[model samples]
Target: GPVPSRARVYTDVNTHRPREYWDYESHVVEWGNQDDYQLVRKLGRGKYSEVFEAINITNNEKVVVKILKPVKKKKIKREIKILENLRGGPNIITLADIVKDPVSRTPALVFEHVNNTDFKQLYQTLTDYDIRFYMYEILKALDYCHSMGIMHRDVKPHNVMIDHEHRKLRLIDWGLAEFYHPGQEYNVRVASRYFKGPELLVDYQMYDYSLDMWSLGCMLASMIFRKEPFFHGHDNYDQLVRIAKVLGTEDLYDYIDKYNIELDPRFNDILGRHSRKRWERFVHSENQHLVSPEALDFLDKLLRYDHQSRLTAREAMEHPYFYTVVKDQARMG
Candidate 1:
């Protein structure tokens, strides 16, 4: 294998924090009364939890209740720890309380309820500046989390709650997040297939906060291209093929070789040689309005073959694509 890469910035974030800061498994939850919150409706069911639209009985305020589904205590602790650590962060979801059932010992996390718009419908109506505004705002959330030594492995639209009416955005679902430690080969299976970066697909596990950049790029690309999943990979192995088909197999090979990564043998057949599909090629009739030159350039920087080469969230916030949004924000304030 070739040399392992470390993040350019925030590499020593966890190192600066106290041991108790990054140590989550040993953290104990201060459980609240289970009857304090009542589930009104099932919002969704995740692999490890059932989400519900709930109400806080004490104040009658609406909230979201995430009922843990028999996961290890360690997993629950980490989520709660990260939430509290990143409390009041830019666009980060607010954790209201942690509660559990008296008899069953079932745990739940209560969070502030956001009036959200379904991304599919919302993306269609987003004015060009709207996209720029929300994307710029989400970068603040990503940068803040990254600065706090957290890698939000899951950065898809599903995890991004956009309150369009209020023009507010919150990056939710920290369940798959992890603290970044240099030289640590983390689990490569952290992100969703559609949003997985080249580092994830090629089995390079020493990735850091840059993983979120790639996922953010995927979300941006999907919106601009008007495709829910721009990279439509059937499975994990096929995920690389889809990306290679667009970014080009030659670059994929170069990235793998640069890292001395052995391609998963499964890719040997399906991964035929393909030239890089130019980003401009994707700009056409329907998407032309969304696909500006600066937008493509910004995206090109985010979705790089090497994780180290991707732009950090702070850098991304200053990209020219958001120039107008930044100007607008300044003028309004």
Candidate 2:
């Protein structure tokens, strides 16, 4: 009944993994290592990379070393370009230096370490004001990147780190970022399953930074309350089911048709008729009531049914959610 909503649950089950067994290599500080820094503990791990808390030998400051798994030459080059492009920003996490891979000598990124926890770990503890402030910094960071013509296709809570002591929020992970060249058509998709935009999910060959705006809304909603945010389905059919249940697949069909996409058969039930067209589901999900008022407005702008209807990060920074809290409601010190 009701498809047994797996997406609705965020169980606090044990997903604990030891840092030592993660992909990248880890080591402790030695007596006098002049070149290689010392790895203190494992910070986080993913399919392609792992981040470790380390001590910088030169300055004796704490840093995080993100090592690309398999250590590909091309990815190393791409990361360098993206990080270089993202430098010199107050909101963007700074890369302190690049460490050489122990084996193939591929480059690894060394980042400044703030005594902070990731959003995933800090969500339950966040007050509405704290979340609003964090999101504002994120939008500002995204706006700066967009102004530089860069697209951060992946925007999620896991990518946000909060320096509680410093009263700051830092945006990290640029592996999926792309530099948009004017008039040069780029692939329409490049993010995780949950954060993908409608145009990207529908396989649009040419799209722009609007995709990021959509994901940003999903993230904001998630931080505000209990919801899957977007793409909360397991398989392709399930994904569409969640989409249609929330966004009214019929309206999405009309929008897709306007964009010259040939709707697919899998979308027939969603739209009533479909043949060889890319499909998108609207995102007017009923989870708005669970969120704070300011966040609801932010999500309303970012997670629109139409790809073109999404708000850019540049425009989101000015939303009242960032500064409307009264002194009694303020959470920051």
Candidate 3:
């Protein structure tokens, strides 16, 4: 069944922005010469692309190559255009060039190299301050994109690269990203399951920039709580159940009801009312050091069932959770 559409509670922030900002089809891709870059090793893979650690033969500089699988031409163009639009934005992964296979026509993107430490290993070693610092770096990326009317539909630990030694972070994997047209209904199947927002699970398609905030909240929860996935659901339907178990099913109902959303019958079988779990429940002796009143409050705002209630990236950066980090950065200079 098609779930009902619900406009996000916050709307039209981008209403006055020119249509060119949101129109992916209107742009032309200036494909780069594939001969210049050579693949070094397979770095990783995702549903849309195979990633590699590569090098620019001309300069001997390291670069990341994302070789996209054969897909609709429109999807390829959209990603290219969005990356172009976001070029030079703070903390955004720099798209150096685009190239394609001569015979297969497989599109590949060349990006600036970050000597990233695997996030799982890096996060484990970070102090509370480090988490806030990197998260604030991520927020700069998110805010910049959102300001340009883009929503990074895929935001997760794997998509966020951190060069921990340099204290640098970049938001990557913009394949699922799209322009935020205030009244547009977007595909609900955007983010990864564990990091997917409540709107995606409930099939509410008019979600906006707040969707990224939800994913960021999930990442923050995992980092602070020492839970790899703060909510572990085996499948899509179970995904919401996992969230409901933690956030309580009652507010989930409220969210749908307010939006006039039709709950999928499959959810009826699994959904039961649950009280909102206190954030303190996640605190343990091992992770207690990462916990704080400000962290909990900031997280509570981001992980809300209602997308409108979630903080925008800019607002989240201003939250008290980051106050200490902000003051410290100010002091460092």
Candidate 4:
């Protein structure tokens, strides 16, 4: 069992940023003309927004327009402010402009167009080297955001855009993101069902940037193990049960105990005592290609029940799992 601790790297990022930089509530908004963005094609849509390919009439340049669905005014402004905050960081999606429909008052974000294949098609065709290269690229984005005191909250493959031919990756979807202040209790209601961490599942709200690291671990597990989602659960209660199946019921109890976390009463019925399964247990005939000593080791570090023990973005990037990928990058460019 563990006690109190903090992230090893970028722990004091909030101290470095000026109050005005992180204070979105007080920041003035510069609304752009939504008319300038002519929708070209529907790109994608989620519960929150519809994304489309667009060409601006002003410059005839291609862009991606994310038209947000109805929500609170503060929520809309938060997204805009975060995109502005993290813009220009490596592999971080660039926010070109923020526009609101003058008539309907709907908000939309204009971003640089990224030529990307659907992640469904991309993940399967990616070589082992490709996975390492792109995963490292994601870590770069995470590190930059964490160093700037923001938690992406959502870090699933859906939020990641990869232009495979160009070897470019962009981390998108800052709608669920928030500024990380020390000892602050954040909403447990962030992140997708599949990628949520033990901290979120257990209702441990004082969680830090390691929350996204756990999400990254979930992503890593799914990709390498050939499972669409490593921890497949029906709902919030089942999510922890699924996690406990792999990491063990005892470890989970210990994790909650360490943090003094109180679990929902629902867990008492569904969470039976389960033995911990090693990472190798999931690697069999189909997924053996992505399994390795380093892969197991790296996954182990990221999936720990203790968020403090999980790898920070910079630490994950330095793992031996990326040894060859790093060398390849050094030689090529």
Candidate 5:
């Protein structure tokens, strides 16, 4: 039996929240006129949606048009509602409008344009200071969403849009995000496999805001260590096995036992006790500039197996990794 008592670090945060605050079904979308936006070109595509660079004919400003493919009506409503609720929050993507084709009734979401450099190219060029600054910007969005009783179930580099010239970072793609309730069990199938937290792979549904922290940790690890995917798991089950090799198998068993989780039989063959690898072990001459004690310390706090043990986004922003940015900003003031 799954342990019902295992709650997140922010256990009671959503306890007294109103249903309208988290409920998507009751939300009425004020659809915008599709005629106002003209498609410029295809920007990218995901499994769930096709994205395009478009222009608002009315305003002559560039925008992103995310035309969702055939999916559950509930999911569409959920994404729209969450975007509306989180509008104007720090570093969160702006949902300018929602529109639909009259004949097909195909829905599309419009957002402000971001001139983004692909993360693979961008991360390689970032200075140590740039990494801290951008990561702190990400924390702002995560903290804002979590404070609004929302969990960004999908957290990955792909979802983060960076305008390097402006030094702006926006957390985008909230399609998989959901409202967090204290005792609710979420689907374990959410999130990209590389960025998926241990809670997801282990089938722990009572996860919370801290799940985003784990994903953020992975993003930071990859950027700092110059490893594209810090945890390169072939599939979902092997994903946890990859993590166990670095974080050690003993604590993973403790996590499962504490939550009364039944380990999948597939893991029995792959699972072996391993001592935790030192973060310093990841350091090399090329990446040493980004591998500071504070960076490692902050990463250590976020990558814990127990979701409750992971640092909150706000807490992570306060960590010493961002101390230089804080100090410099203060001096400017």
Candidate 6:
């Protein structure tokens, strides 16, 4: 019930701009300090923070104000770095500003006001191309992130924001994203059940961009053909079964010999397979026709058995499916 009042807000960068960009900044009064912001309504909540819709009196602007209870300063810093490094891309959400509260020792993020609902809910009104359009924009944004050496560990429909006015798509949320470098070793588990990639499932410590590609494929499948996520079981094992059933097409001849852990007997055959033979069963099924041809081609490149075999952001955009099929452009020479 904090009352709204006019006040200037600033963050570490010190790059001052008009308050009209209220959607860009995330910081406000001192931690534990009484907020002059008028609490409008709750935007959303996550692990360590709650977001509220508030207004800034300085420019009389309305904005989403995120409040964190008590989180390590380092984690917030890490999030800011990822947000700032996310360069200019029309397919991605824009960060307005990062501000701080002196009393609560929390930071608030300012972001562009998005009125339309998220893709998960927006899919209720479906057309043949609704899923394809979402994929096109998401991949374009993802490709931009991958080229910048960032891995969005999480890729799902909920993260895809659509503008109701123009029907444009923009990818948001980088809480699990990290600055990924080739040949680097890091320990972190991220992504949702349906979108979790193979690398995340396997015990591989050092993974790369291909992890995201796998998730992207799963997300597209859910939106267009499955009308549900690839994995949505009561538990983790249930998810592995869905993945094995869909992406397990090739034989286990080599993979089983190379990675026996994947063939553990504790889980069902569908969950512990080293062969892609299972996927072959689904490829020609009725769902095949439900998926758009362009999306099918895009999924093929995004779901390569070998992570290294997957296409990069720049390369995926150049695929014939994107140009000729999705964009309505003729094939390039």
Lowest summed lDDT over 10 consecutive residues: which window, candidate 4? 1-10
Q: What is the lDDT of residue 15 in candidate 2?
A: 20
lDDT of 6 by residue, 1-333 (tens): 111111011111212423322222343322222254556788778666777777755556776666655666655655666666674665776655666665554677766564646788876446545555556677788777765556788877787777767667778777677655434564546888677765555545456666777788777666555557655656666665655555563432243334443445555445554444433344435466545566667777777655656777666767765663365343222
Put down candidate 3 lDDT per residue, 76-159, tens digits, no spaces.
889988898899999899999999988887999999964875566677667998899888989999989988778899888888
| lDDT against true structure, model 1 | 0.86
The 10-residue segment of model 3 with minimum total lDDT is 1-10
Q: Estimate each model's TM-score.
A: 0.95, 0.78, 0.92, 0.94, 0.94, 0.76
* lDDT (Cα, tens digit) per residue for candidate 4, span 1-333: 224456666777877878888788888889999989998999888888999999989999999999999988888778888888888899999999989988888889999865866655677556677778878989999999998888999999888987766777899889999988876678999999999998888777788899999999998888888888889989988898899999998988888788777665666667978999878789789888888889889999999998888998988999999998887644322
Model 1, span 1-333: residue lDDT tens: 656889999999999989899999778778889899888998888878898899899999999999888977788889999999998998999999999988999989989864765455677557688788889888999999999999999888778887766677888888889999899888888888899888887778888999999999999998888877989999987888888888888877788888888875766667978898988777778888888889999999998888888999999988999887887643322
Whole-model lDDT per candidate: 0.86, 0.64, 0.85, 0.85, 0.86, 0.60
Which of candidates 1 and 3 is the stronger one according to lDDT? 1
lDDT of 6: 0.60
Global CA lDDT computed for model 4: 0.85
TM-score of 2: 0.78
lDDT of 2 at 67: 74
Model 5: residues with Cα > 4 Å off, grouped in runs: 5-15, 328-333
